[PDB]
DNA sequence: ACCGCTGCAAGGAATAGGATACTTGCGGGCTATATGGCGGCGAATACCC
């Protein structure tokens, strides 16, 4: 709350969200397996604020990935805007069933 | 000599992956209703006395 240390390494506790507008990126390290609601939380937890904020999404190896975990980047990438959730939650209908 | 604490299991949300019950086509193994040929002849009816 006060920013006095700037960068946060955490586990997923984070993902609830208490936002500062402070706060405008966010770097993963896993990205193999995090499903696609947590993605698009996390990445609109971000903001608060009139300052562009950025979400910088770190992935292995691309053949260390998995089928479905290329479904699920390539989903996250193909949308990129505000009103996402909801059609990307459309979209897991039908993904997860 | 009593107590609040730490810590160590028991039960919720997200992914990969084999086991294994289930379904299917077969291969061999078995059981069980006609219509263009005559001629001769002898027996068997039919017949009308």
Same mark, same amino acid.
């Given at each position: 709350?006060?920013?006095?240390?700037?960068?946060?390494?955490?586990?997923?506790?984070?993902?609830?969200?208490?936002?500062?507008?402070? #706060?405008?990126?966010?770097?993963?390290?896993?990205?193999?397996?995090?499903?696609? #609601?947590?993605?698009?939380?996390?990445?609109?937890?971000?903001?608060?604020?009139?300052?562009?904020?950025?979400?910088?999404?770190?992935?292995?190896?691309?053949?260390?990935?998995?089928?479905?975990?290329?479904?699920?980047?390539?989903?996250?990438?193909?949308?990129?805007?505000?009103? #996402?959730?909801?059609?990307?939650?459309?979209?897991?209908?039908?993904?997860?069933?």
């Amino acid at each position: 709350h006060h920013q006095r240390f700037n960068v946060l390494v955490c586990t997923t506790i984070i993902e609830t969200g208490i936002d500062i507008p402070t #706060a405008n990126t966010i770097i993963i390290e896993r990205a193999d397996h995090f499903g696609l #609601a947590q993605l698009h939380q996390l990445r609109g937890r971000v903001g608060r604020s009139h300052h562009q904020a950025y979400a910088w999404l770190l992935t292995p190896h691309p053949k260390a990935m998995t089928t479905d975990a290329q479904k699920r980047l390539e989903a996250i990438a193909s949308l990129e805007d505000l009103g #996402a959730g909801f059609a990307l939650a459309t979209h897991d209908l039908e993904i997860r069933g």
